[PDB]
Amino acid sequence: AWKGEVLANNEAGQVTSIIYNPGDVITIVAAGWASYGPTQKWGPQGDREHPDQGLICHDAFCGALVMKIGNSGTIPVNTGLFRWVAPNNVQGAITLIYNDVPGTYGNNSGSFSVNIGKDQS
Ligand SMILES: OC[C@H]1O[C@@H](O)[C@H](O)[C@@H](O)[C@H]1O
Ligand SMILES: [Ca+2]
C-alpha cells in the first residue's frame, strides 16, 4: 500500500509504490486542502467554479486530484476510487498529481493526504 501527501505545487506529481497491473482492483481515498493560487483552499474535487484554462486533466476541476498510470493520460481521482479497475491496456506506476495548468504550479499551496491500496480481485 501507499500513504502520503501530494503537494499542490509539485508539477511533476508524486510517484507512489503502486504499480498498476492488468486486472488489479485498487482503492484510493484522498483528503485535505490545497490551492492553485488563491488564498482560498479546495478539497480533492477541486474548484467547481473555476473554468478550465488548460488543465492537465480536462475531466476534473482545477485543483482536483488526478493521476497517471504509467505513460497514460491523466485520470480523475478526486476524493477517491472505490474498487476501481483501469481501462484496457493501462498499466504501470501510479503517479498522483494536483490538477493545474502547466507552468502555473509555482504559486500553489497545501497538499492532499492520500491512501492507495490493491484490493481483493
Ligand atoms: O487556471 C489556472 C490558473 O489559475 C490562476 O488563478 C492561478 O493564479 C494560476 O497559477 C493558475 O493555477
Ligand atoms: Ca497555480
Side-chain angles (χ1 to χ4, degrees), residues 1-70 72-90 92-121:
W2 188 90
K3 173 183 170 181
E5 299 74 46
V6 183
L7 269 50
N9 76 346
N10 188 19
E11 177 164 5
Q14 183 76 293
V15 193
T16 74
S17 63
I18 310 300
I19 308 306
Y20 186 87
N21 302 311
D24 278 353
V25 180
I26 61 168
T27 286
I28 302 182
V29 179
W33 304 100
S35 176
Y36 55 95
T39 47
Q40 182 167 0
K41 290 190 165 59
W42 294 264
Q45 300 181 124
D47 182 1
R48 73 197 295 268
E49 304 282 26
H50 189 60
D52 186 341
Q53 295 167 350
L55 303 164
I56 61 171
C57 185
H58 298 295
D59 298 327
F61 292 122
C62 182
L65 177 68
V66 301
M67 71 180 181
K68 287 187 175 180
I69 305 177
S72 79
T74 50
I75 304 169
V77 175
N78 295 307
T79 61
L81 308 168
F82 182 84
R83 306 182 180 172
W84 182 87
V85 177
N88 253 125
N89 286 94
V90 165
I94 304 183
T95 292
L96 297 175
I97 319 166
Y98 193 70
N99 197 22
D100 201 351
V101 179
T104 79
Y105 281 76
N107 66 344
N108 297 2
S109 64
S111 65
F112 297 140
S113 62
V114 190
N115 284 98
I116 309 178
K118 293 185 177 188
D119 305 324
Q120 223 173 11
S121 64

